[PDB]
Amino acid sequence: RMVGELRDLSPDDPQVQKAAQAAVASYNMGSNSIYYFRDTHIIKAQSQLVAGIKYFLTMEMGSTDCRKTRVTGDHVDLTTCPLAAGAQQEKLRCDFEVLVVPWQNSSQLLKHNCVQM
Numbered sequence: 662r663m664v665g666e667l668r669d670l671s672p673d674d675p676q677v678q679k680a681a682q683a684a685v686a687s688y689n690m691g692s693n694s695i696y697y698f699r700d701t702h703i704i705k706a707q708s709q710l711v712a713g714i715k716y717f718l719t720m721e722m723g724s725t726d727c728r729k730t731r732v733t734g735d736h737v738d739l740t741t742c743p744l745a746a747g748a749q750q751e752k753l754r755c756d757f758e759v760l761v762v763p764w765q766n767s768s769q770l771l772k773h774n775c776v777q778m
Contacts, residue, residue: 665710667717672703676761680706680716680768684757687770688722690734697727698753699739713762715771722775724751752778 670677685700692698705719725742726749745751755775761768 663710663712667707667709670706670708672706674706677703677706677708677716677718680759680761681718681720681757683761683768684716684718684720684755684759684770684773685722685739686734688755688757688773688775689729689737694724694751695728695730696724696745696749697729697732697737697739697742698722699725699742699744701744701752704754711760713760716757716759716761718757718759720755720757721778722753722755724749754778 681700681703689697699722700720701723702721703718704721707717709715723744726745727742753775755773757770758772759768760771
């Protein structure tokens with residue numbers, strides 16, 4: 662078995678960004694809201710070395726005006742989805758654990774825990 666150091670990374674790190682996008686996309690596939698949520702801010706980002714790499718992300722999200730009825734996943738561009746304003750506006754502070762392995766393309770959201778703000 663292989664277990665490594667838990668290290669702090671920059672939120673702007675390009676591989677942290679991909680992990681975040683995989684974390685958000687997985688949340689939307691399993692969330693109860695009609696609207697797609699979107700990452701607004703990445704607060705903290707750590708990485709741990711395993712047979713692969715685990716990414717421990719603390720990040721803020723926001724509900725959008727984009728709906729699952731009108732737009733399907735895998736074909737949704739969250740950059741074209743505006744944050745909902747008033748009445749619907751819902752914010753979440755989420756902890757994400759993203760596993761990335763070399764033999765796979767799709768990263769996995771292994772665990773999550775969101776908390777309204």
